[PDB]
Amino acid sequence: PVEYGIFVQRGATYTINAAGEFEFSGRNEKWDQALYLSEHFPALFSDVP
Amino acid sequence: MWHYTSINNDTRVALDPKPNQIRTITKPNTVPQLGTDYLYTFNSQRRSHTLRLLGPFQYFNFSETDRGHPLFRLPLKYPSKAIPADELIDNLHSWMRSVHLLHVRSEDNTLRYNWMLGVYARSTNYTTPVGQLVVNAPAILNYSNPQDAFNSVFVALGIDYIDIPITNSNIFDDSSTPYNVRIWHAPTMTEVNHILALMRKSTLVSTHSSWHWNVLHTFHYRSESDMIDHFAAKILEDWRQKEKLDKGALVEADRVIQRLIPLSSSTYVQRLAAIGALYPNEFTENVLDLSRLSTALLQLSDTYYQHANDQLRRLYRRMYNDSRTLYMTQRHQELLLAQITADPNILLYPYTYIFTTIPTSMNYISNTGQGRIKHSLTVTGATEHDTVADIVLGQTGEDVITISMVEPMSIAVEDMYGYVLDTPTRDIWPADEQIEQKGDAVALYDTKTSRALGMFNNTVRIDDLLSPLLSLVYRTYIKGDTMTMTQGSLDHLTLCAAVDSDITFVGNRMIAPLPEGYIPKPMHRNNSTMKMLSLYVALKKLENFATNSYLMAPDTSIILLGAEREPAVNILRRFNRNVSNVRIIGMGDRAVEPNIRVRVPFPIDKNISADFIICDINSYEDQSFESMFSETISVVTTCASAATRALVKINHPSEYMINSVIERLSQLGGVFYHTALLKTASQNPYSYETYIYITPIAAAVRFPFYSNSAMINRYMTAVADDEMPIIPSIHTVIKGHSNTYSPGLFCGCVDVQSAPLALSQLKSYCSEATTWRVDSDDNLVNIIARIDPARIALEFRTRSNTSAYHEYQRYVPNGLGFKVRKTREFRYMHREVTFIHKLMMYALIREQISLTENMTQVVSIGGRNLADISVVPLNMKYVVIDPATRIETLTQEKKNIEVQSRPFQFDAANMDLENNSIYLFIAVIMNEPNGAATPARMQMDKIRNVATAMLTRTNCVAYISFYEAGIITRLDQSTAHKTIRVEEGRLKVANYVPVDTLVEADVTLMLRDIGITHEIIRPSTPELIDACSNYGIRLGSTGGAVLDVFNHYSPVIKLVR
Amino acid sequence: MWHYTSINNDTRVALDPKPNQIRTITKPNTVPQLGTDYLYTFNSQRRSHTLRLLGPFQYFNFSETDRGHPLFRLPL
Amino acid sequence: IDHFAAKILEDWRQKEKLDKGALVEADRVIQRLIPLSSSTYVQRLAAIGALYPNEFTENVLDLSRLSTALLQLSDT
Ligand SMILES: Nc1nc2c(ncn2[C@@H]2O[C@H](COP(=O)(O)OP(=O)(O)OP(=O)(O)O)[C@@H](O)[C@H]2O)c(=O)[nH]1
Ligand SMILES: Nc1ncnc2c1ncn2[C@@H]1O[C@H](COP(=O)(O)OP(=O)(O)OP(=O)(O)O)[C@@H](O)[C@H]1O
Ligand SMILES: Nc1ncnc2c1ncn2[C@@H]1O[C@H](COP(=O)(O)OP(=O)(O)OP(=O)(O)O)[C@@H](O)[C@H]1O
Ligand SMILES: C[S@@+](CC[C@H](N)C(=O)[O-])C[C@H]1O[C@@H](n2cnc3c(N)ncnc32)[C@H](O)[C@@H]1O
Ligand SMILES: C[S@@+](CC[C@H](N)C(=O)[O-])C[C@H]1O[C@@H](n2cnc3c(N)ncnc32)[C@H](O)[C@@H]1O
């Protein structure tokens, strides 16, 4: 739970920036597959420590 | 120094071992050593472990079998703290024992070992065709000519290339790699050109200007973002390298153009390629932020894409449209030539344009890293201004800037216990003087003292002024950090005032260590506590001046006559715990135990006596003046009768009250009471309350009455003000050259682009202005700037609005501050006492000058850096004759100020004083131009010459400041003078050389002999309040003690014609 | 000294941060420091723990999720 | 009642400082609460609160049970 709160405070998803940096949402939302073609990626798989 | 000097070498080839060193390259026998074999580090803020092998192992692919080792389990094992060095070493060692690269050692000395292919084969556990080739023919790894090492595996396998995964440098992270390095079988330049051309037909690939082992290699990126971060890191590497090459230093660059060449990439990578090749000046100035490097780089391209310069714009565009070409300076190109000369078959990237770099003259200031800039704004500059727009400053959160009321006073502890004296001067007290002084004291009592003085006295409390210091002594003592101090020492008394617990030395100069688990509460102190201590110290210094120990003598007593809780009685009782037999008791009408509760005068039955008394009686009740007078009289009478060394308070020290006290002591039978007025540094800085010091002496006291005493002037000159007190505003709108601002300070923030404009405008008001950004990411720059009356008095003399805007724009964006920590400004900044006395004298002379009609100019001789500018009205012309003054012909012409810049001659015939002129001689007569002290007879002589020289003049007004002799009599007996001194009978204010003082009687007598009009005036209390209210200054304690006796003994002669 | 001298200001408004300071207002990078970021105290006579955040956090509603954190399990 | 009491203490301390002529950074000039609808007792607190009785400055009241003393003060 604690690590979870720290992870999900960052955001459930992120977008790669044109400059290449990740930008996490800061929001806790359920993923939908409509998002798969969207700019967003699931944040579990960011591999950002 | 144009030509580059460099020694290019294939460092990566040099890293590859001889085949014979491969067996021991792990050093199986010995443990890996920190800083040589490995580089562990734990960043606690990031909670991220980072191990990094040195030597050949810096390039090392890991087999999943290698990743199954406990060494890599370690960071998970210690989520929050550093891996202990023992575990790191033992796991790193056992894993080193785990590795064994295939090799065939041979006796040829030309041979090397293909480290890359061997570690790769091992990492794939020899499953790839390269791993097969290596497991069957290890000898293929050995090589003489570096290139052939790969050609051998290209021919033998029949493949055109090999895709080697890259290594992460930090062996701990197992994250997927951004890209990977393909290696091509292209021995000739032609084969290389063809591969490059074909590479420009395919997605997301790039390559270096030249390659290691002279073998062509291409990076293939898994995404655009990976390509961007890679190109960025390389641009930083190339820029740093070129930055070093252009300094003419020899460099061991492994390659001449460190940056990557896109072969196919998106828009953004092409932009990075372009500004990268440009080598923009902005990098060298640190104008870019490297915290998010690529971002800034992209932004930089955006400027260059539309750059104000035509050459740089067209150059950037042209580079953007031919990204595949490798742009490089001529000076790089000659290095490429030297490289191709030393190694005729070296491969390097063939498509290459050679541009001449475009010079740019704009030297931006910049500094990433913490520290706010404290600008000193110039009054004027090359830039002109016309109707500048109002510059709004933003609201600032308390997260960034807090505005405390008064600056706490940093100070040495001993300085708290100082006091100043004022001895009586008059030999007689005429009855008409008694009626005059009584009328004065009654009129002054009936209508309350100045409201502004009350505001300052009630705002600048001594308790808060001392609080950070007294607590600090408590905090150190609580940690046991304090150790050595003498028994009677003032530091010891401060310690007793800081902690409630009794202290005890274990021996000479050594306090006892705290018992375990004991953390005694800080001593509770009211506002008068430290003052009462300082009065006790004063009596100790009065019984004999030379004493260092402050402990009371055995078999002696003291009384603190005014009492309540009276913490000082407890502190004093505990300070003297080691002295045998000593009474120490308070005795108020409100007194709580230990102190006896009793009224004064004492009941006729009760017997009260002591060797010392410290009265602090003060009736809270509003009352008739006659009752206040009779009560204070009876209090001084009983205080003097009861002790040989009374230290009575005088709440309303008019000349009448003090003189009535002297007359009353005169009336007591058979004893002659020597007396002196006194003021400790622990008093509230603004209080006019004064402590008379009564003692008996066998001799009758010549000159016992007071007249025009300093301590008395502090009170009597204060009177009810016509105006409301000047509350210090915080301004938020910087108008252009407006002159409407009430005293206070500008405070807020602006977009950093607008910052140079803001500093350009507030130069009109504030003399100096601290500024800072909070972070590299947030564009707003915070700015704080106290309003200087002197800068207003200078800048507003004329309507011209020049400034150094052109210089201030060299600051944006990194050149004007960084500070994450919240800053704390005060509405009342500390200033040394001499500075306050200067501002007071200026308020006196300025108010005096505004009254005079029809004067063409102010001639301030010895005016230094326009120090007297505040005094002169904006309309009339100002003149300076200080040799030390710097010349600024533009500032002088623009602001209406002549500067003679020559030593003023005091001989009367040579001297030429203009009519309708105000001649300031503020502290100039007491010194020679070179700064050596002028002997007092020469000072009275030059004052006499200024006097005789203006006798012919019709309308002229001299203001000759000087030092009266009486102060040396008073400072010899005082303690509170950290600034002022008395080295061999001469005053030594500030850092100035010691200087002999004039006697006022002989000076006035001489001026009467000359017959010129004269009036010895000194600045009073309202001038002090005006100075502090206008400049935003709080007085401070040592200043409060010394300012009365100092101000009174800097008379300002006012010659008038 | 009849007339009052005072500088009234909306201190509560001053406590509210610029939008840019909000990202780092937690100061994620560094540990909270006693007497600046927080004010812990234990009254042994009352046996009552008392933590009190400084800065903007002095005004801070807690989600039940925030109250589920071990920090709040500490006094027990 | 407890709220009005704490506010009365805040306003009284503030006014006690204002009447000394010291400059103050009061966030608001009259710190005490105004009932819009309350019971008898809160109206009593409102009244002695607004009075600024001398008894506070003398420390004649005990703050250990502030509202109680305040109620008693109104009774006098
Ligand atoms: N797996 C593996 N990769 C290597 C080895 N040597 C070099 N490389 C990789 O090959 C790439 C090309 O080599 P370089 O010309 O040195 O490129 P580079 O980016 O300047 O390398 P750096 O020294 O880290 O800056 C680099 O990114 C390295 O990561 C090796 O021995 N093993
Ligand atoms: N820094 C640049 N360098 C070269 N060309 C650019 C640059 N910025 C924009 N362009 C040109 O403009 C087009 C992009 O338009 P635009 O600038 O509106 O959006 P963008 O790609 O997000 O760039 P920016 O971030 O500058 O807005 C590209 O096709 C490119 O040719
Ligand atoms: N302190 C007071 N201030 C104003 N009115 C009061 C006060 N005390 C009593 N009263 C008036 O008297 C009535 C209450 O009667 P009484 O005083 O006998 O009992 P109470 O409410 O407990 O007050 P107390 O505690 O003074 O006895 C109320 O309706 C009120 O109008
Ligand atoms: C300004 S206070 C300072 C006392 C002491 N320094 C302290 O604060 O602990 C002076 C006290 O003396 C008391 N006092 C006033 N007039 C007195 C008198 N005539 N005789 C005895 N005590 C008196 C008052 O009650 C007042 O509390
Ligand atoms: C104490 S400083 C300035 C004091 C005061 N703040 C003011 O501006 O008048 C006095 C200056 O006067 C200059 N000075 C001293 N003797 C002088 C002389 N005989 N003629 C002209 N300037 C003199 C010195 O250079 C010195 O810097």
Ligand SMILES: [Mg+2]
């Ligand atoms: Mg390299």
Ligand SMILES: [Mg+2]
């Ligand atoms: Mg509030």
